[PDB]
Structures are given as C-alpha cells and as structure tokens.
C-alpha cells in the first residue's frame, strides 16, 4: 500500500529553526495528490497547520509568515520527500507533528471541497519538545 515515514524526536532550543521531513512510498505524483501537515498537542485537540496542493503551498491564518512547506517529485534513487521548516519557535510548540496525503485525482470523489480536504492516510508523528 502507501506507507509514510517521518523523522525522529528532535529537541531544539528556543531561537533557532527546525525542519521535519516526511518520506512517502507508494504515491505516483504530487500533482495528483495533496500533502497536508497538521499537529496535535498533548492533552489537547488537533490543529491544521498547512497544505500543498497543485504545487501551491499555503498555511493557515495563524501560522502565516512562520512556517515553510516544500516538496519534490520522484527521483530514481530517492523517495518522495516533503519538508516543513519552522523558524523562531516559541516555548509553546511541544507537539506531535504528522504528515498526511490525500488523492485529488477524481473530481467527484467527494474527499475534497475546493482546496480543503480530509485525511485518508496518516503517518507516525514526531515529538518536538522545546525547553530552555
């Protein structure tokens, strides 16, 4: 099937940047798919961070100008890679990040509504704990 792996538990100091990678296995092209990045705080609810669709990456209204999402296509000796960089993180960013894909091939599939969509395949999630 479609299997996705992510990075490990990275501990970072406040003031620097961090970069989380996500490798896919099974997808064909990111033009027929869409990669959404959400998070989940411990003991709280989930939160939608950003997404990349039709080679157009965007974020939410609360993380504008803070995060950066990038993705590349297939390579003959490399899996599909989706990266997300966070710069100038605060002391309230300790969370379990995820990496989701959604197939946007069929127009009448019902899984997507004009850019915003659901999550059909989930990853494992990386724990990021920031402290002084």
């Amino acid at each position: 099937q479609i299997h996705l792996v992510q990075s490990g538990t990275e501990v970072k100091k406040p003031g620097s940047s961090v970069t989380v990678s996500c490798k896919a296995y099974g997808v064909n092209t990111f033009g027929l798919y869409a990669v959404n990045w959400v998070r989940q705080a411990p003991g709280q609810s989930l939160e939608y961070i950003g997404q990349i669709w039709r080679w157009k990456s965007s974020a939410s209204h609360h993380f504008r100008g803070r995060v950066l999402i990038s993705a590349v296509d297939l390579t003959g000796s490399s899996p599909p890679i989706s990266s997300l960089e966070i710069k100038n993180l605060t002391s309230d960013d300790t969370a379990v990040y995820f990496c989701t894909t959604t197939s946007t091939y069929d127009r009448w599939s019902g899984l997507h509504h004009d850019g915003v969509m659901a999550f059909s395949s989930w990853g494992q999630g990386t724990l990021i704990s920031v402290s002084a």
Binding site: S45, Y48, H61, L111, H112, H113, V116, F119, W122
Partner: protein, 108 residues
Amino acid sequence: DIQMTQSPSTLSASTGDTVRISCRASQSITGNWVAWYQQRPGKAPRLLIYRGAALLGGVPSRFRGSAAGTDFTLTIGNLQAEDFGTFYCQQYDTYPGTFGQGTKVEVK
C-alpha cells in the same frame, strides 16, 4: 470558522452495546461536509467515515453515520474490545478545517 461540539465528553459501555456520538456545528452544513476519525491512545489516527454516511475500504459495516442539518450522529453497534479510543468529528466545508473535541470510550 465553524466551532464543533462533540457529545458526550467521556462515556463507558460494555461488549455488545451501541454507542451514539453526536456532533453539533455552528452554522448549518447542508452539503454534508463532515468526517469521523478514530485515534487509539498512543497509536496513529485512522479515518473511519467520510462524507457523513459513506464507509471506507477496510471499515466493517457495524458502524453507521447520519446527518440532519446541524446534527451529525455516529452509531457503533456490536461493540468489541478493539474499538476503545478517541473519536473526532471534523468539518471541511469552509476554510480552514476544524476538528472536534474528543470522545473517549472506556470499558465497564
């Protein structure tokens, strides 16, 4: 920005009962743009039901979902020992998407 309210907060049942979880939005979602997810404690989340009343490949037929105006309900009949976890109702009608609040099902 539509705020979702899930009911109940924390409930308990036994092996063989039926669990009904309700979700109430802010506006009136007349297009049935809602989804029900399941996440085990410690494991990865899993999408159960998309578009309110449609199942996914690999989901058993004991789960059922219904939509009526604002109220989206989810019925789980023939409860087993592996369905104890957190359930989420999430809309994707308006940008951006917003999840629910969490509903844990214990055993007693």
